[PDB]
Design a protein around this ligand. Sequence first.
Ligand SMILES: Nc1nc2c(ncn2[C@@H]2O[C@H](COP(=O)(O)OP(=O)(O)O[C@H]3O[C@H](CO)[C@@H](O)[C@H](O)[C@@H]3O)[C@@H](O)[C@H]2O)c(=O)[nH]1
Ligand SMILES: [Mg+2]
Length: 343
Amino acid sequence: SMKVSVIIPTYNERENLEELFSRIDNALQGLNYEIVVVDDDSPDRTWEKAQELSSKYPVKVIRRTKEKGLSSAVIRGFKEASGDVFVVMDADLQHPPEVIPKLIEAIKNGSDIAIGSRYVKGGKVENWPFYRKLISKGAIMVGRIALPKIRDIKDPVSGFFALRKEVVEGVELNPIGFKILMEILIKGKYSKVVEVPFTFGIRTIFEYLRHIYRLMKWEGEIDRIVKFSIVGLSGILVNEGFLWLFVNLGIPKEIAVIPAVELSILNNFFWNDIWTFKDIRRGSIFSRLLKFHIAALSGAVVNFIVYWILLFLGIHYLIANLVGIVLSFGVRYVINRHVTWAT
Ligand SMILES: Nc1nc2c(ncn2[C@@H]2O[C@H](COP(=O)(O)OP(=O)(O)O[C@H]3O[C@H](CO)[C@@H](O)[C@H](O)[C@@H]3O)[C@@H](O)[C@H]2O)c(=O)[nH]1
Ligand SMILES: [Mg+2]
């Protein structure tokens, strides 16, 4: 036997509690389940509805008078729950309790985390327009790319998931976090994660980006970027340095850059292999060298195209030039982190 805590944070949720609880109990009938409801002193009748339903449903109601926030509510729920398996979902019925068996079965089969996912095969998000569905996936893309850990997670931003209690014991999760699932995906202890398709139902970006910056720092990814830029600086030295020498020994300036840029690449790869990424090196050292070349070149292409496009859009050459170097750097790092150094 296992005890299942369905944790549900609430603010102004009322006309949902009756049919929500109805559907949880039917889906979770027989299983030792508890419903933990954290309410941030909502002006809504609720909390008040929830303790009355504590007469007909196993419900433990938490009333926060001087704390607010979706992610902070879930943290508390983790503290107040005695089950072995946690389920987090929303009160507004956008998360269907009928897929909760499918979530817990996935935990039983050996997965530490089970995510109700909109975007895996089978998943749906009805009633949502295509441009709002794009920017969601896309924002998700930025996360999957910036955080290699969650690369394969197609819906890391779900508020609808399940997890084993051991994933969050003794872990400190940011209460200011935008989305709790990713705090768990980054700082949680686990081995397996699975996504479970569900159909999203009927009833900010700069906040999301600061979160990723926080997760990128915590994972040490900001460090990797810092140490990457330092390695690039050395390149500038070895590049210009061998250029001057080359030009002084007769070699024309137009033909001296060619070996000088290449010696800078070799320089930059070397320090990168044995410093920035010494922990995630793999395959041949010649094969990492080959890919690093593809990386430095990819950034050149990205720089060229972005430069010229901005020019056609009317942007100042010096501003188009700066954006084209920045984006070059970004792509060169991403391509290096994911491909050249594939963990
Ligand atoms: N204690 C507390 N509870 C909250 C708060 N805000 C929301 N809750 C509860 O969080 C649930 C969802 O809030 P929504 O306002 O409905 O969020 P959404 O934008 O519709 O859903 C999006 O974010 C969710 C969380 O990640 C996702 O589950 C969903 O996919 C979607 O991305 C509701 O049950 C709501 O009562 C809060 O500030 N404090
Ligand atoms: Mg909602």
